[PDB]
């Protein structure tokens, strides 16, 4: 009913910055928008209730403003704690809806990924399946692409990937991407290639091998 929406989705920021998340109400509430801060593997906690009313213990850096359809949470100075995921959520009309969520991330310099393309172990091949792994390593920002090309035939819909969360030290992400298939087909092709694009790479990085050669 009362669709609530946040922005930006993601937010590069570093200790000492003035961050600002923007919530939007498709409808009109008054001051019934609250802000929450849940970290990975944790329940959200209230920061600002009312529209500007800060909750107990919420440090004086978190500040709320706006009314009607345009709201905004503001952090006057970023701290180590403040790196988390923020939500907004109207409590004016039934039912109560929440914002998509805005993630704040520690900003650092652009770093391109170090690619590593792992060919199937001879024992998984016994299993009938053959998983070809592609590891993009210590890159920043997140935005990176992986393109599998078996026998120079760009593959699609035959792979999966999992990204790592901000490195506590490097502030760099790490991505794995597996090309999964049976062995009859793994045994039916020769060249497997992981073409990797990242905005920190001058050209796409291609890693490949040859089912058989060595």
């Amino acid at each position: 009913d009362i669709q609530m929406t946040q922005s930006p989705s993601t937010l590069s920021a570093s200790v000492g910055d003035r961050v600002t998340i923007t919530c939007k109400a498709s409808e009109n509430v008054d001051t019934y928008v609250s802000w929450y801060q849940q970290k990975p593997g944790k329940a959200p906690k209230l920061l600002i209730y009312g529209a500007s009313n800060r909750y107990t213990g919420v440090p004086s850096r978190f500040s709320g403003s706006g009314s009607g359809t345009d709201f905004t949470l503001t952090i006057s100075s970023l701290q180590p704690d403040d790196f988390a995921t923020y939500y907004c959520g109207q409590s004016y009309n039934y039912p109560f809806t929440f914002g998509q969520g805005t993630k704040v991330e520690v900003k650092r310099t652009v770093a391109a990924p170090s690619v590593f393309i792992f060919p199937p172990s001879d024992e998984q091949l016994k299993s009938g399946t053959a998983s070809v792994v592609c590891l993009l390593n210590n890159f920043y920002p997140r935005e990176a692409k992986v393109q599998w090309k078996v026998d120079n035939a760009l593959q699609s819909g035959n792979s999966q990937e999992s990204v790592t969360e901000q490195d506590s030290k490097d502030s760099t992400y790490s991505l794995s991407s597996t090309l999964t298939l049976s062995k009859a087909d793994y045994e039916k092709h020769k060249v497997y290639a992981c073409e990797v694009t990242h905005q920190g790479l001058s050209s796409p990085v291609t890693k490949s091998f040859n089912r058989g050669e060595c």
């Binding site: 329940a43 409590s91 929440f98 172990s121 790592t164």
Partner: protein, 220 residues
């Protein structure tokens, strides 16, 4: 702090019903509204309903209206969430905030409900062995493919947790088959290979599986 006490749910076969609890103190129970909020991992928050502190008037979401019922217990001072006819789409984390006005102030730690037909399986650990047919480069890349298991989670160490630097254990991915799979890689100086042994330490508590796969540097 500011928390409540949830304690229900776990792994549950689809179509089958389930039920969570939300224990609250005598005053809290007869002094505020208890909202059950939902959150499917990787998505925002869905409000499921509420219940007035005096009588227990319940207010649901017309979606969950159809198959989720909120109740309580004066004698026990506990709220409830009956989840009948479960779908896989119900795999989420459930909270039970407590608060004034239309505010969700005091949130519970949340209970995870996992709907899956999948039986408990031990993982198959494969080597992500470093190619000798590769470039020197500088470092290398060790790894263990912990494939096909259920349910989460797994504890992946490297050399009994002696090697802890440059170790990226990726998030478990749910394959189409319904089984998870994740990788634990650790880049090391290509020269260190051969000289220093590298053995991952897979541990799956659910199926009581524990396997130590040593990974050998192999071009082929």
């Amino acid at each position: 702090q500011v928390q409540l006490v949830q304690s229900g749910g776990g792994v549950v076969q689809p179509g089958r019903s389930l039920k969570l609890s939300c224990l609250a103190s005598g005053y809290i129970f007869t002094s505020s509204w208890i909202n059950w909020v939902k959150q499917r991992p990787g998505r925002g928050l869905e409000w499921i309903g509420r219940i007035d502190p005096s009588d227990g008037e319940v207010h649901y979401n017309q979606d969950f209206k159809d198959r989720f019922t909120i109740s309580r217990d004066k004698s026990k001072n506990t709220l409830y969430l009956q989840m009948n006819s479960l779908r896989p789409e119900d795999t989420a984390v459930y909270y039970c905030a407590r608060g004034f006005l239309p505010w969700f102030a005091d949130w519970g730690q949340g209970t995870l409900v996992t709907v899956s037909s999948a039986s408990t399986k031990g993982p198959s650990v494969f080597p992500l062995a470093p190619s000798s047919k590769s470039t020197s480069g500088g470092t290398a890349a060790l790894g263990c493919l912990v494939k096909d298991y259920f349910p989460e989670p797994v504890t992946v160490s490297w050399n009994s947790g002696a090697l802890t630097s440059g170790v990226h254990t990726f998030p478990a991915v749910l394959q189409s088959s319904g089984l998870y799979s994740l990788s634990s890689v650790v880049t090391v100086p290509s020269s260190s290979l051969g000289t220093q042994t590298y053995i991952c330490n897979v541990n799956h508590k659910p199926s009581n599986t524990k396997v130590d796969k040593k990974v050998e540097p192999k071009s082929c």
